[model samples]
Target: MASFKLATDLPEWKKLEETYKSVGEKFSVRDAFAKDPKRFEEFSWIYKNYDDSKILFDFSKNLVNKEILDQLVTLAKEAGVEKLRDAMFAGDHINTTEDRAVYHVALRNRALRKMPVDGKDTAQEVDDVLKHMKEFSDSIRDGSWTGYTGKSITDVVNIGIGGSDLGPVMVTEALKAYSKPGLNVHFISNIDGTHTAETLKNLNPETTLFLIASKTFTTAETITNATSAKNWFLATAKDSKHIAKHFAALSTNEKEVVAFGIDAKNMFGFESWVGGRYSVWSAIGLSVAIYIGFENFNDFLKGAEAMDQHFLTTPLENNIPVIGGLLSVWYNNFFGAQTHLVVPFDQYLHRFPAYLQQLSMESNGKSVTRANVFTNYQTGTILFGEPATNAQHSFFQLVHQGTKLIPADFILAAQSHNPIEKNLHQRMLASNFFAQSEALMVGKDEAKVKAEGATGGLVPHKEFSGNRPTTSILAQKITPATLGSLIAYYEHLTFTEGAIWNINSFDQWGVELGKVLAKVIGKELDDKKAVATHDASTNGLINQFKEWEE
Candidate 1:
């Protein structure tokens, strides 16, 4: 309940600002490496939690020395980073704007650590739902649960938006190899009719199961899509009594869920403290439990819990995510880097960048600080990226020679899931993963370009600046445990950045305005006689759409 100071208002900010101006301006990664023989050893750290799995974070390629890093850590302490982190885990209402505890960590505590909320240990509740997920998932996997016509469930269509949709969709696809055979999973999030229509087209009503995943059972897009799915089901079943068999709810609104034809016994719920973006560890991951089996899902939870413990205990200097977050702050504030890129070398992780886009941007993309004052400096980086090899062909040119300073992260697995051609493909992939970071750090000079036979105008065009910064993440493998740890790494990394920026990262008030405006604009579109009071551009677009309808 203590008042927090804005980051710029802190004394460490001015100190770091002064340091950046004095010594940071001339800091170079290549020169630092040349001067210090142990540069990589000093900057990089490897984290090992689970057996046969290690996550190595190589930050040596970035433009930072001990002095800059020490100041950044000092800034973190001055900004009360440790205090805010402890408050979050202790069930304090750190999300002040929403007056809610940011306690999603309770969801993945495999040991059932006694985290109390309102005089009760919420860990028991978390385990209870996880048990429910296991029992229900086992029944479906074993063919004990059937539809109205006694058909085994072959396809699961999850209906939700935002975190509910993105988390499950990304995890399922990322871990598709571990999924049980004879089952297929699909997702429908967009409000467009085609999303629901196309997903339901190939699915038979008797062989399909629907999971309604809105927390309140009242999200506009989710309920609309769920209603449309219900209409599709009843058209074939002809009886509402069978609804309980084909549908289950991942919602806390038991009354509404029952009214929507789902039985109360089939409802899975979580606490209000669990934000949508971080709900994957809660009942929002039931589809993940169903697809990958409860054991693997439990392993996933254990992995996240390990990272949670690591972040909780490690010092700011040695903390893996802390280092990553500090580098982000250094780049955004001092170097004027506006964007951060993440490119994974594995094809299975194609959507990982998009998933992080929401996690980072949605969490810290705030103009106002926790003190309720507008910030005078940058807060969050514009995060974006795609899977590598493909991204190399598309955007690598700009990253290589473009004038903009883009800080990037490259991910690779030391071991491969699919080591085809006797690991030739994986070796090639690993080569690019290693070479890209090296290439970004040590770019080609004009002399080197000329030596490679580039002459005249081509020599200038082929020259590389060689000072682009990159962070490389090398993991043992992309198992469920590693994936969970990877995600938690970024989750806490974003947490560290938000804490340093003095922003309420847990609350997302900015997303509501678009939804509110959409309702007004949608009503105007449907009624020809309705008044259009919006701006000239919006009014003209609506009128043109109406004209096109005729």
Candidate 2:
């Protein structure tokens, strides 16, 4: 339960503010690392996975030094992170707005024990769809699930939005090496027709399966896209009865699914506690299960489950997710950082940042406290990123020389999946990974710039005022298990930030509000006349659209 005590009003908060006022601006990660013999040992951690491989978390490069880290630990203790965290794991109602437990972890519970919510077993609910997914994916993988023309389905187009699309698309891309040959996967999340047209341009009716995913089978964009996709299928099949063969639903609304001509038996379900953004571990990942096979998908679950265990069992001082979340709080609330950058060195992880964008922003984007007061301090940081090397040439310039303080994370797998060119590509990329953080902290000072024979204008331009903060994550490789744990790291990372802010991290009323407005405005678009019962800007935009629609 969230306390009415303002997080900023805690004694730890005032002490931390004094500590921040004293040394916050003067602290340099570069000088800290140089003066302290054990900065790396004290600040960093090596997370040992169930497998023998390890992931190194180098928080030593952050702006925080040893003394402030302890203060942050106290701040976390005062913020009730452990209380809310245990509440979520115990299936208590932590998502107060929705009156639901923020227990997506139950879907990935590798222990497979009784995770009860309101006296009902949730682990059984998770296993139910998991078994259904395994059987359904296995049949498709074995070429036993045929289409209307008797040919086996080859392409799976997952039709969903938000968590449904991003999780499957990101995991599939990151684990492409683990995917089975001849098993193709596509995703359609955009309400725009282009996403649908481009996805369906070359797909054959006889060998394509449309896996429609929506929690309630009522998301406007998802259901609209699903209806259009079904219409496209019907244009080829000409018979509604044949839909059962090539269509499947990942939703709980069996009545609507059956009415859509999808067989009720083919529907997979997760519970009300499964938030849209956290549904990947649930049935929404059927595309992922089918593409990479159910085994790798299970490893994906185990990976996150392991991280969940670490978050639960580890102490606040040494916990990886807790430290990560605390560093975010340090940068955002104390240092005025407004954006977070996540750059993965692996090419397969180009979309990883996008996936985390939703996970971080959407989860903690709220400001209302449980006591019905708005928080005056910062809530959460905006998250954005692109793949490295490309990001190096792009916004890396801003990160290096720009004025804003951006707390960043650089992810690199020690070994590449492809490792082409005799591993030389990975070597160079890994070098860049090491150098980026190095340059960001130990910058090219005026002395270094002058010694290179630079003129006055060139000298000032070339000199770097370093001390940018970044966290480096070096994984063994981006395997299914590794990616899952990585996702959980962020999942819990943002949760801790929200816990400290005393905001609800599992609800998205802001997202639903826009859809409600769009529905009202959409009614005026088809008619020649328009209504102006809203804001001037919105009404004008609607009038412009009505005029342009000849």
Candidate 3:
């Protein structure tokens, strides 16, 4: 294993430390924009895909300038982000703790370039999976794959958790406009029996297909939900042979999947190198391909591939995700921002923030570096948000007038999918989308509040403290490719944060202990004869649960 200097020990980190004092606490976005004529043009990044889909990233409303941007770029360089990213693309075992190559990029290797992982052609493997996904999705979309009762499947329930659940759920919901008409896609993620029971009540046995997605087919929640779904199906179908018709496995464990009564032919496998969060690019995207056609799915892969190439080749200062990631470091380490709020303007993107929460928090929410030494500095930001307009009315009040500094990101699509009533709704949404960042940057001061007829007592209450930094992303529309690019942007942004922080972004060992303890506690809950060995609080809860058993 290779050892590296801590970011705090680096020269650029020290330089930024100095710069932070010189330009940090006293920075104002409105004043900076006034001073620099080309502030917007200079700070913004325009991404035009090969297919001519454009996205504008307006970052001028941030508490950063040319000096700080340069220092951040150097800090990222001095922290070895470039070398680490290069190692990642070259299939080196950068996920050193797990001794695995972080190579989800290979899943979207549209360039068909050779990428080897464990002496296997990862690109070739990805191509084969893509072919499989296409054939399977096509068969279902064209009505060639029928249920036991010879009915066309109308409902799809993706049964998984964490990476398995979040990615597919977010993508399906985000791209619902692209879905095949008459087909409904549902996701059951919670371990509660109600999650499965409630969904089963609405779905028809002959018209619903079950996708049991677990890397190991033994994940307690997923398997339990899958079994419940299978029983629900069997209660109607009766014959065991019909199990093969409705169930598909997105897992690597063949023996366990076969034991679950899913056909061996219906199993889709991804590599160990493909971390759960990144599996959406792998065969975990089967539901995505099925909802939209294989063609749109391929477009999705291409879009991600385009951003991957950009992330790989672009210089640190100009790199989009790199800049965003470094801005995170600036706000987190220097300005004491604890949270990142991402609010998508479109209602279709309601789950986008939840998806990003898993991607960001699960990846960089680490306390230890790659060398296994615990870090003294902050690593990941607390990421959360709901969709905008709704969020604008809810928690944005705190963001506008609250004491905490929240670095925000707002996403808006220029063209609406459903542009109703002469585009009035979208126009209103667009107004808020534009007005939010501007408001956050140049807030209503006491003078402005007084000018608006707010008296002395109401002056402080109405006065808005500006200079809250925000990044606004305006896309042409949420096309399959555009959505793919948007997701890739955040994925790479999370990667850059981990890369700079020297953490293993791929390995999620943090979540394992809770899962392990759950199994032990579950057995304890069932065995009323066993005495509790945990803390008083835990033991009391367990005893109370057993006594109050439903």
Candidate 4:
């Protein structure tokens, strides 16, 4: 497939491979900046917009010079990334592992392009769902849709895990002010009873809508909660028929949904090609469409589709996602870095780190290829982070002085999404974003430490190892569109790394074995039967838990 072959065939890729073997070993960001007075000017780019917001991206913190940047661009070409980029636009099966088409871009598809998947045109399907979502949301928001008790719904509970919970919850929280006047959004994901118990305490069953979001309609946690919620609803209202109006579902299993008390008309569906993590654009985003309204949701989809076009058509050097991916390969494959940090300057984007964790780690966290051969290279990149100034106080010390070499992506916006002004908060946030990247690249050296009056020996211990790599992403604002663009950027970056590793980036077989084993153990535990076929540690932990209970 085009996506898999982009690793080394392009002319640019040959140069990148050569550069990694040669100058990359000895190159230092601090030394490069010291020699070039125009380093900052050379690295940064500003984007001005009249209709939207204006932003600036300063990538000077990364360990790159003109030579390295050229090689990185070349590497992108060698991987046949351009070909796969077009395929994605044409609705090809870029997700080769699943043999399904990748079309998260269609969620915000403003280009009005129609593409075929499973013999059905997807663009029309997208518009159909959007139409339904808007009509339903308007009814609820305008009070035309009232609860069974003749009251308006004051709360919405979304029940699903992983991508089901993450994207919509993050977006709703990110744009809290845009939410309907009377509605509050709550999420329940954990299997632990406490999550649902705490959230359900104040919400009245008569005035609360439950959005059950498991696509399969059979996820253990989701089904369990859905059943429990049905019980809870009936307990208060003494009615099972009214559950159809109050409970909606995002699932392909319409038969099961209708059987579970959700009206078939109220169930939204998505295709197999839409991976769970990337399904936010599909019906999985029903909650977001409900909260932000269909117009803004359309904007978010347009933003992602815009970046999708950029990834497909833009040259390697200027392509945001492609460049981000190449830099990741440099750190993971050549520089021997194992972890990637994501620090967003906006507090509204606190969940950005977790969202990227699943997008990056789950996509590439593998050691074997589709051909079943063990790879000689690392695949997954560890992702962890905190939002800007908050992270500065908490873990910046370890990031600065720790023995580990951690490459980071710093995401920030030119303006705050918050309409209310709070003493130039955006400016203050922007300053910290610039300062952290500056600190990473131009860390204090022993000579500077001695100049500050410390002895030579004392200075050595305190001296900074100044060549940590970082990429800066600046957006106009944290709108639905911009956030969608940011996520698509990382998704393509993950695609680039997977191409280099010769593995099926779209599949996650490794997560299955543990799940299968857990089922067996759970069955034994439920029956109070002794488990003999188990590892020493597993057996001990099981016994310990049971012993405490007894």
Candidate 5:
């Protein structure tokens, strides 16, 4: 791999900066479309699959002309993005800070081809775990896997946090239309007792199966909740021997898992190279596999693998994810934009933005580069969004006329899962999807606002700047395969940003400090006589909590 440098220190970065000041700043999406009849054809791309599925990415609405796009692509080349990306796919320890391969792609290597790590191919191991997932999930879905009272498992409660919770929850909900009949899935992530209590409130102990997912079987929230769940189960079963029938683990700590009463054969494992934010492709996706069945899960993997192939082989100028990342850089570095908005038109995809929030923010929210030097410019965008039509009423006003420049992405499907009311709802949704981007680009001028009969001071308030940037993502449908491909698109998009910014996108040392502090604070919370050793505000809060408890 090539050496790392701060993006601002690169020669192309300087050239792009100058370009932004000289000509890129004057670029307008509306003007560009007016000037070039085929602006969409020039700036957009479509990824067509063998299955006749299509995902369209429209960058024509963004604040970039061809010259600016070329400069951004050049910046990517000078930053050695292709080299780093090749290193990642080649199984190099690209996550240098942690000395581990960022190899989550292997989890969804659907080809089952040989991918060697440490002189051994991981295809067999991946396939073995996948087969185990299929058999176990098949049993539970069919009438073969039973609980203590010989009742088929009907309700699944997955206990895990972070990646364990977010990814599976998002995918299962997004693909709920494809779930098996009579099988329901629930998630419990928060350590708060109510999260577990409420989830188990209506579930029958005899019909419920618990999937305890923790890579080390030691995450505090996961183990605590798992133990609490076990206590609940034992209250009904009255024997430790029955625990194995109701519980399975997604973990590598064999001793801890067995000690917790999960059967050794029921423990599904993955490697240390998979980070929590990316672990849904690993055994942590058991909940998804259970709900959607192994075949759809295989489709999901194949979709991601297809995207992996595209990102690997495509050129920088025409690459979908690369273009997305470069536009992000354009706004963040040059336009001083600090936030990115994602609004999905489909209600089934309400959680997609939240999942992407973790993927993008956790991966690139770094102040230091790979060379251990403090960055001179912004790194990650503050990603926050919700399902649209609802979000239109809530925050679209600020996005349109606010002082801060905010880049946005709007996703819509041509066909709806529920094509109800003679397709009126979908047509309305599609209309809004196209109208929002068009309105953002060709916003109302002051003269137009006045001509529309806005009187006096209202004219200025009604006028829009007419230059807010947006990207429109249109898909044929939201199948399991499409969901997988959409997620991989963003995954590689985030990878591109981190590679350009020269940061370690894999390691997450920042998340550890809070966990360590929570342990000490928790002990202090339990002991009345424990003196506080931290700041005045923390000690005061601790004292207040103790007083309230008493």
Candidate 6:
């Protein structure tokens, strides 16, 4: 794989880094925008037909000037980002630590073009699963696919964990209008018995199809729930052979999958290179394909592919993900901001924050670089948030009134897709979306507070020190493709940031240490035996749970 090395030295990076420090100490977004009338015009960019494109991004609410952006781009160049970008596009094994080619792009390979990866064109394999998904989904939706009782399927339960659960569930909920009316979708992610019990209670064995999605077929939560689901199905069908008709898996472990009674033909497969967090674009999207049909599924790929092209071809100065990545570096490394807030105004996008947590955290949450040296600077931003109105009622006070400088992203659509046409709801949603940034930028100072005729002693307390950073992302409509683009945009942003930080963005080995420790603790708790070698918290929790009966 080719190396994209940063052109600048540590001293040069430190010099550019100082500019962010000066801005934080002296300049404010409120003053910057107010003093410069061309702020919005200078900061905004339109790509791929601004008039016709479904996506619009506005970043003028932040405190960034031309010089700052130029330095950020230079910093990206010095980091050898362009070479890494090309490697990822060319299907090189950029995920070197994992030794797999990063090809989430194949999931959305609608053009049917041959993608040469590691001396093999996997495009045919991708399209094969896609074709299978479409035919099966269409058959189930049209009543051609029948249960053992000869009844058409009515309920689909997707049993998975992490990306398996979040991506498809989020997409299914987002594209609710496109779902087949009689076909109800249920998702079981947690190992809690209540989740599966509740899902199965309203579902009949013959009328429900269970999609067991574990790429390795060994995720404890997914397999456990899948076993229970299979038990319930066999109880009514009276034959384990019928399991093939009702149970399909998105797994590569053919031996275990077939042994568990699911036909290999019914199983969808993906490669190891695709990280679990970013697997939704692969066969992990079977439930999404079933819900919205293959056309919309292809459209999702088109949207993501378009963004991939934009990220690959465009210059860093005007690039969407590039700009986002630099901005993240500016806040995290220079200004010392610790967390990022992703507040979507659209209720349909409620799961977006949760989705981003995995995307941003799992991708860039590395302590070591690609070369395995300890990082001298911060790399990733902590991600968290909710929809606007609910967030305003809950946490907006901290953003508006607190001392912490939190950078936020406000995502909304210009139009809602629901038939009810709640223009009032949309307006209310947009009002907060627009107003929060304005308030953050041009906050109410003491003069403004006094001019508003506040009571005597409340003037100073009522004053707002505006200048909290925010970026507004607006779309014409929320479609599967647009949502795909949005998710990919952040994925690439994290990638770029990790590249600049010299970290392995694709691996999450940090998540395994605790998992290994938990199993021993699990056994100790189950056996009601005290363990001597675990941490105080783990030992204490195990001891407490062992003695307490549920």
Instruction: Give the TM-scores of the predictions, in the order they appear.
Output: 0.98, 0.98, 0.98, 0.93, 0.98, 0.95
Counted clashes in each candidate structure: 1, 0, 0, 9, 0, 6
Per residue, candidate 6 scores C-alpha lDDT tens digits across 243-358 of: 86799999878888888778889888888777788888888888888877888887777888888878988988889988988888878887888999999887888888988998
**Model 6 TM-score on a 0 to 1 scale:** 0.95
Off by over 4 Å in 1: none
lDDT of 4 at 529: 54
Q: Residue 150's C-alpha lDDT in candidate 3?
A: 97
Per-residue lDDT over 242-313 for candidate 2, one digit per residue giving the tens place of the 0 to 100 score:
889989999878998888788889999888898878888889989988998999999899889989989999
Estimate the lDDT of model 5.
Answer: 0.88
Kindly indicate the candidate among 1 and 4 with the higher lDDT. 1
Instruction: Give candidate 5 regions above 4 Å deviation.
Output: none
Instruction: Please list the residue runs of candidate 2 whose C-alpha ends up more than 4 Å from where it truly belongs after superposition.
Output: none
Q: Candidate 5, residue 289: CA error in Å?
A: 1.4
Error of 5 at 283 (Å): 1.0
Q: Which parts of model 4 are misplaced by more than 4 Å? A: 1-18, 34-38, 45-55, 370-372, 418-424, 512-514
For model 4, residues 1-550, the per-residue Cα lDDT tens digits are: 4334324334665566578778787678878878999987887765332225434556777767788887776665555566665666577776766687877766666566777676567888877877888888777677777889888877878899887888877777776656777787888988888988998988899889988998778788888888888788888989777887689999878888888888888988877767777878888888877777777877777767766776766677776677677778878877788999999888888888988888788888987664456766667789888788899898888888898888888888777767357747777778888888888877888889888889946878788777777878788778877776677778888877776665666666665453577678788677675556698889888877766754
**Residue 479 lDDT in candidate 5:** 89
Candidate 3 deviation (Cα RMSD) = 1.2
lDDT of 3 by residue, 465-526 (tens): 89989999999999988988888899889988887888778887877765888778878877
Q: Report every candidate's CA lDDT.
A: 0.89, 0.89, 0.88, 0.76, 0.88, 0.81
Q: After superposition, how far is residue 155 of candidate 1 from its true place, in Å?
A: 0.3
